Amino acid sequence: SILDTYPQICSPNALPGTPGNLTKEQEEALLQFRSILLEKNYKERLDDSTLLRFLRARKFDINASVEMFVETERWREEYGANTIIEDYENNKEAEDKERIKLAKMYPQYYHHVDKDGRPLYFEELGGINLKKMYKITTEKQMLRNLVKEYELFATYRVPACSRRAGYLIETSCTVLDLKGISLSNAYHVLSYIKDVADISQNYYPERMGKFYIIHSPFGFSTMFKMVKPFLDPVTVSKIFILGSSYKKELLKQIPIENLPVKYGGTSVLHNPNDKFYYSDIGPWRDPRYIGPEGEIPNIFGKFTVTS
Numbered sequence: 364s365i366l367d368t369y370p371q372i373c374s375p376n377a378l379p380g381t382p383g384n385l386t387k388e389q390e391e392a393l394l395q396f397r398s399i400l401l402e403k404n405y406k407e408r409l410d411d412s413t414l415l416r417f418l419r420a421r422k423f424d425i426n427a428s429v430e431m432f433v434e435t436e437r438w439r440e441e442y443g444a445n446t447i448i449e450d451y452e453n454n455k456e457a458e459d460k461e462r463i464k465l466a467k468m469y470p471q472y473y474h475h476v477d478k479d480g481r482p483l484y485f486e487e488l489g490g491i492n493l494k495k496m497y498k499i500t501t502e503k504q505m506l507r508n509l510v511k512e513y514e515l516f517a518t519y520r521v522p523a524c525s526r527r528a529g530y531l532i533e534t535s536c537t538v539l540d541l542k543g544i545s546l547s548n549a550y551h552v553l554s555y556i557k558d559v560a561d562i563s564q565n566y567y568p569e570r571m572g573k574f575y576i577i578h579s580p581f582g583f584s585t586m587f588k589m590v591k592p593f594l595d596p597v598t599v600s601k602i603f604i605l606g607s608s609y610k611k612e613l614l615k616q617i618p619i620e621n622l623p624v625k626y627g628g629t630s631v632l633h634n635p636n637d638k639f640y641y642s643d644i645g646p647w648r649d650p651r652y653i654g655p656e657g658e659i660p661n662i663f664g665k666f667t668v669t670s
């Protein structure tokens with residue numbers, strides 16, 4: 364299968380319970396977990412990486428992991444996550460135009476990788492005007508866009524980055540820039556954040572590698588306490604709200620050459636006139652690391668900056 368075309372073993376320097384770094388009891392639990400799912404007639408997504416993500420999400424409690432997997436398979440089918448990429452490619456023009464309309468006001472882009480080879484994802488929220496934003500998109504539409512990105516990440520970004528790093532990469536490094544937002548709006552979008560967390564926590568286990576929140580407004584940490592009840596403590600332990608020294612802090616995790624100049628690095632686009640909010644630069648754009656899955660589609664249509 365496609366999995367035979369890229370490393371399925373994590374770096375030996377990874378956390379416990381990850382592919383290739385299992386204890387004897389974890390190996391036995393994985394074998395039992397798969398056996399149960401197969402006997403329940405499941406066939407897809409039974410690979411070590413996928414199954415270990417669920418097992419880690421439930422501390423290797425096999426029955427709890429079976430419940431989580433069973434419910435996820437249900438959701439993927441009811442929500443259409445299994446055909447989200449195909450459906451997109453069958454109505455690409457219309458969908459591309461929508462993303463282009465929102466790109467400048469709500470930058471969302473991947474730009475290279477972190478020191479461990481994880482896709483580096485950036486979001487800028489300071490230019491968002493809710494009134495204007497909801498004239499172009501709906502809340503559910505934004506949620507579906509995020510789910511589509513989750514699928515593109517697993518389908519195209521994971522394989523390319525794993526082949527580049529020489530080992531399995533299953534998580535991302537995220538940087539949320541809140542420069543320009545008001546504490547007020549942060550509280551006002553809590554319901555959306557809750558929807559994102561619900562889908563992400565329950566159906567996309569162990570996908571978070573690093574998560575930084577920068578340029579947050581005074582009092583944001585207090586506002587964040589409202590979000591914690593929607594997140595597991597493991598997830599919370601991977602989210603870091605940085606202050607004035609964030610530039611140096613980011614450089615501990617990301618190569619300076621990969622980090623955009625405005626965030627403390629020296630990274631620039633081949634064409635100085637291009638915009639980061641139309642870019643999608645990374646290993647998934649390198650012929651050497653693109654496999655049988657094919658190259659990722661250009662989410663910003665003709666405006667997509669791939670270099």
Ligand SMILES: CCCCCCCC/C=C\CCCCCCCC(=O)O[C@H](COC(=O)CCCCCCCCCCCCCCCCC)COP(=O)(O)O[C@@H]1[C@H](O)[C@H](O)[C@@H](O)[C@H](O)[C@H]1O
Nearest residue numbers: 420488491548549560563564567568569570571595597598
């Ligand atoms: C409409 C505008 C919205 C903007 C504001 C939009 C905010 C959202 C923007 C972008 C979304 C980014 C999503 C990033 C996803 C990263 C990967 C991921 O999905 O990780 C998954 C979780 O993803 C999430 O929880 C998504 C939510 C993360 C925190 C988001 C904080 C947002 C802060 C917003 C601040 C306020 C902004 C205001 C902006 C105002 C602008 C005017 C899995 O986590 P992980 O730890 O790997 O495994 C879990 C497992 O799953 C659980 O089962 C187990 O119990 C537990 O033990 C672990 O095993």
